[PDB]
Amino acid sequence: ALLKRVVSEVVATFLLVFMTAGAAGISGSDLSRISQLGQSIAGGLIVVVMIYAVGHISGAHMNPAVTLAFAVFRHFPWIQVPFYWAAQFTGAIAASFVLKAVIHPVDVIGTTTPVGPHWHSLVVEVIVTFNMMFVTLAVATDTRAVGELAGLAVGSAVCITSIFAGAISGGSMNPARTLGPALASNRFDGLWIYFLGPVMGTLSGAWVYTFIR
Amino acid sequence: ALLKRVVSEVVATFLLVFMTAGAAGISGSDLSRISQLGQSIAGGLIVVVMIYAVGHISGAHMNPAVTLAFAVFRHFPWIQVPFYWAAQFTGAIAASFVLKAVIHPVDVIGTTTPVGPHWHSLVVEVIVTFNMMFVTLAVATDTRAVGELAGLAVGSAVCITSIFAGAISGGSMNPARTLGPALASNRFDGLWIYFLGPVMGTLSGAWVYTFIRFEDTPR
Amino acid sequence: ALLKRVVSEVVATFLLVFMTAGAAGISGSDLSRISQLGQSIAGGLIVVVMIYAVGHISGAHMNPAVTLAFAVFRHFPWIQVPFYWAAQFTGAIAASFVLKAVIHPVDVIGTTTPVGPHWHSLVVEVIVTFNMMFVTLAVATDTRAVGELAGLAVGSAVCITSIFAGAISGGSMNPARTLGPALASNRFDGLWIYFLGPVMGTLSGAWVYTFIRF
Amino acid sequence: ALLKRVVSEVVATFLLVFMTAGAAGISGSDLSRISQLGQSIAGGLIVVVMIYAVGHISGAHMNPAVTLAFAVFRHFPWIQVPFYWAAQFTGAIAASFVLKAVIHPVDVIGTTTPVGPHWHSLVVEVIVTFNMMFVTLAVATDTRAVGELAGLAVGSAVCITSIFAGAISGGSMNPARTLGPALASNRFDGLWIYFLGPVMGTLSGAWVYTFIRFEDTPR
Ligand SMILES: CCCCCCCCO[C@@H]1O[C@H](CO)[C@@H](O)[C@H](O)[C@H]1O
Ligand code: NA
Ligand code: NA
Ligand code: NA
Ligand code: NA
């Protein structure tokens, strides 16, 4: 079971970063090849796809901050958390180095970096990650919520992040989605934001939902 | 119960306004940062997200004119209306001022103000608000409707309003969503429209659905 | 009950046309106010909204050609068809003239008129209307289909029609949605296409679905 | 019952290619007529619509590589594979020539051809087709998946393909949807990629889903 969940998360996060960072990097190189809104939509839709494809096998976390929040609030076994982390970072990094080849001569592989003061990007990442984790705890753990629509709801949140936070921080919510492209592009500006921001956001969204449910 | 629902409404209206106004304001300052269509899609999607997040906790009104319409048509208890109201205005205002901090130097924080003669904005806000409350009453209160799709159905209305009414009134339907950004941006052009228009919209959309949901309608 | 269904259809069709022709007319006037894709998206979304609002009351036909095809294939009673037709045209025409006042000085109120040779628009209206009626009959009348997703499915078809057929015929599928704006705009080019194409479209789509269904 | 499924696949594949290649071709002639994003959305939405129309009839394959993968992994009878392939190629080519008539004087009919080095298009077609088939096998065959949402999930994969792979290979995943337009355009650049790529993509996607769907996978 653990092996199949690990493979599921490797593949789901690989596809998440491949489509998200691929569309972002091509768009950033030339808006006539992929529009800004088009790359934001693609980032939302790949989360929709992965949730309906493996949400019932691994839970489709694709995101180390999400796995952490689920474990902290007793929705997921702590013993599996390092494995999920190993899987998500592995898939994100593989995706990014595959892109670095197949979208060449584009050499900024859909990184998330801050526009403007870094603290803007800190606060925005926290809030938009909160929104995503808040709805995630509802649709993934509350029988009173509409679980069949989990994919649409979480993808919607990712799309929002991409449209709005994309203009400030690049709209990550996801240390692995950030770190892969950063390595493939050798671009690390503000990297710590994309670790601290999302963890704060996932832990607070979860906490607030756990209070109100 | 009540306090959880207040917290729900404050968080949901905050996140509604943060995303709606922040995307609309950044877009309004520079369309290469966020496209017009992008800021409208974000507006609809945040309402989808919040309905799937808290519809089963507080009803995810996130809008005082919706709360009012629900109470008037006996779907929501009057005693909690002020609490919901305070939550929504609180969240909206808090969000607008966090935006004012973090989208700086953008200074117009996604306001809704009239394009052209103000009665165009009044008529449009009533009708697009009617649309949103009409479908809301159906999906939230009618067992024959598809309650599981409430978020998608209401968000779709919100998206239409942002696309079409965005070009005339700014597409609010939501007195708190208008007022927060107004205070944060010191822009109040036509502000009364965004109270009267949505109230008339929700009351009338609720009234019409109430008339058609029953073959023999009471009263 | 017929009264409430007629009111349902007047309201739903008014709103379909108000949003669809409103967005199209403002976009046609100035793409910086509403984008081309934006107005297409609004056209699909209002059908989503109306199907979830009144599909369980009147069936959210909103379209005389759809009402007709439902009745021909015995899914809807013939005696209500004229009332549905009256409701639909009435709502469409009223919304169009409401638009004429509130989007002034825009004066083309979101019409659907052909681009290039008229017969292109005829064929395309037939085919895109087939697609919409085909999915409609599955989701509205086949218990093996996903009835809960009917609004999403039918609205999707409407959005495709706006995006693609919008470049050829204006993408109507809907005699009332075309006639309302035509009257409000005083523009009638190719009007007959938007009666005959959609009727052929809905009848043929319903025929083929009726043939393949189990 | 086979004739009904064959008619279902002719019609579904015809409408898939009619709307996908029609929008792509008009957009490729003139972005002011249909936007690039718009034609991408049309491509995803027609798959949504066809899955909800005929998923319960024929299974809404509309794609010979999908039929192939379903049959290899014992979800579809081998004996019907040639009938579905015949249906899909007939529907697709017929749609292409109808378009050639009604979008004239546009003469490139929504073709999928490589941008840049052809090997990129091979790799990308494999990966994006893998994504499509992976979710497909979940929602069409796994009782734990949300089958009612199959249309939306598969249409979403198609949309992503059109947006991202559209800038590299044209985003096909579908030998039929490539071949029809190529014949009608007299345009065959890198055609083999749209046979090999999608076949590799659906087989490996179906393989990896088969691997992960069971704790103890038979073999
Ligand atoms: C991952 C590497 C895959 C190897 C295949 C590379 C794709 C080459 O591409 C092919 O190159 C041929 C030249 O031999 C040309 O004749 C074809 O037109 C072209 O499509
Ligand atoms: Na539930
Ligand atoms: Na219901
Ligand atoms: Na059903
Ligand atoms: Na299921």
Residue numbers in the entry:
A (entry chain A): 46 to 258
B (entry chain B), D (entry chain D): 46 to 264
C (entry chain C): 46 to 259
Question: What do the study authors state?
Answer:
We corrected X-ray intensities with the approach of Wang et al. and solved the structure of Lsi1cryst at 1.8 Å resolution. The structure of Lsi1cryst reveals a tetrameric fold similar to other AQPs from bacteria, plants, and animals. The structure reveals transmembrane helical orientations different from other aquaporins, characterized by a unique, widely opened, and hydrophilic selectivity filter (SF) composed of five residues. SF of AQP1 is narrower and hydrophilic (Phe58TM2/His182TM5/Cys191LE1/Arg197LE2), and that of GlpF is wider and amphipathic (Trp48TM2/Gly191TM5/Phe200LE1/Arg206LE2), whereas that of Lsi1cryst is the widest and hydrophilic (Thr65TM1/Gly88TM2/Ser207TM5/Gly216LE1/Arg222LE2). In Lsi1cryst, however, Gly88TM2 exposes Thr65TM1 to the channel, thereby making SF wide and hydrophilic.
Silicon (Si), the most abundant mineral element in the earth’s crust, is taken up by plant roots in the form of silicic acid through Low silicon rice 1 (Lsi1). Lsi1 belongs to the Nodulin 26-like intrinsic protein subfamily in aquaporin and shows high selectivity for silicic acid. High accumulation of Si in rice shoots is achieved by the cooperation of two different transporters for silicic acid; Low Si rice 1 and 2 (Lsi1 and Lsi2).
